């Protein structure tokens, strides 16, 4: 046998959860009927489906502009990563290396993968077509 929510004679609403750090019981048997259930004599039986057991929970610019900037920062027949190697060789030019890395990361973030092993001529053909 199981009791319904109508044979409780005097449930009320849940005004406030806590005050002063003390948790307030919401005066209704809704959460006890969600966790377990009652018999005819008023005992309690609890659900026991806790497989994972959760031991912490238990206790609580445009791309064309990018290509123009890269073709500006490259010499012919040179890769982008090789340009990083040369301009990083404190380096000789920190600011142009910073600009080259920034343009490379803005090209990587748009989905273009593998831009480091790319010569100047293939990027020029990409800007043309």
């Amino acid at each position: 046998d199981i009791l319904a929510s109508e044979d409780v004679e005097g449930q009320e609403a849940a005004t406030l959860p806590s005050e002063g750090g003390v948790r307030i019981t919401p005066f209704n048997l809704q959460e006890e009927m969600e966790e377990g259930h009652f018999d005819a004599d008023g005992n309690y039986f609890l659900n026991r489906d806790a497989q994972i057991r959760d031991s912490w929970l238990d206790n609580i610019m445009s791309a064309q502009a990018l290509l123009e900037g890269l073709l500006e920062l490259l010499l012919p027949r040179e890769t982008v990563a090789g340009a990083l190697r040369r301009l990083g060789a404190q380096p000789s030019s920190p600011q142009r290396l910073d600009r080259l890395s920034g343009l490379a990361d803005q090209m990587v973030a748009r989905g273009n993968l593998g831009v480091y092993q790319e010569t100047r001529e293939r990027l020029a053909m990409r800007l043309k077509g």
Partner: protein, 56 residues
């Protein structure tokens, strides 16, 4: 504490068995051939900060 450490040493000595023959194992050599990874030289503290912020 001496007796328990000696207990662990006797257990590790008794449970020892020779390792099984297999192909030699290189994770970073297969990571290096991928174009998505690059190699550099960094200080230990900088890469120690990079690892923990990437984990965060």
């Amino acid at each position: 504490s001496y007796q328990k450490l000696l207990k662990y040493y006797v257990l590790n000595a008794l449970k020892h068995r020779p390792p099984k023959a297999q192909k030699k194992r290189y994770l970073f050599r297969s990571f290096k051939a991928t174009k998505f990874f690059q190699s550099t030289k960094l200080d230990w503290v900088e890469v120690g900060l990079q690892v923990c912020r990437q984990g965060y």
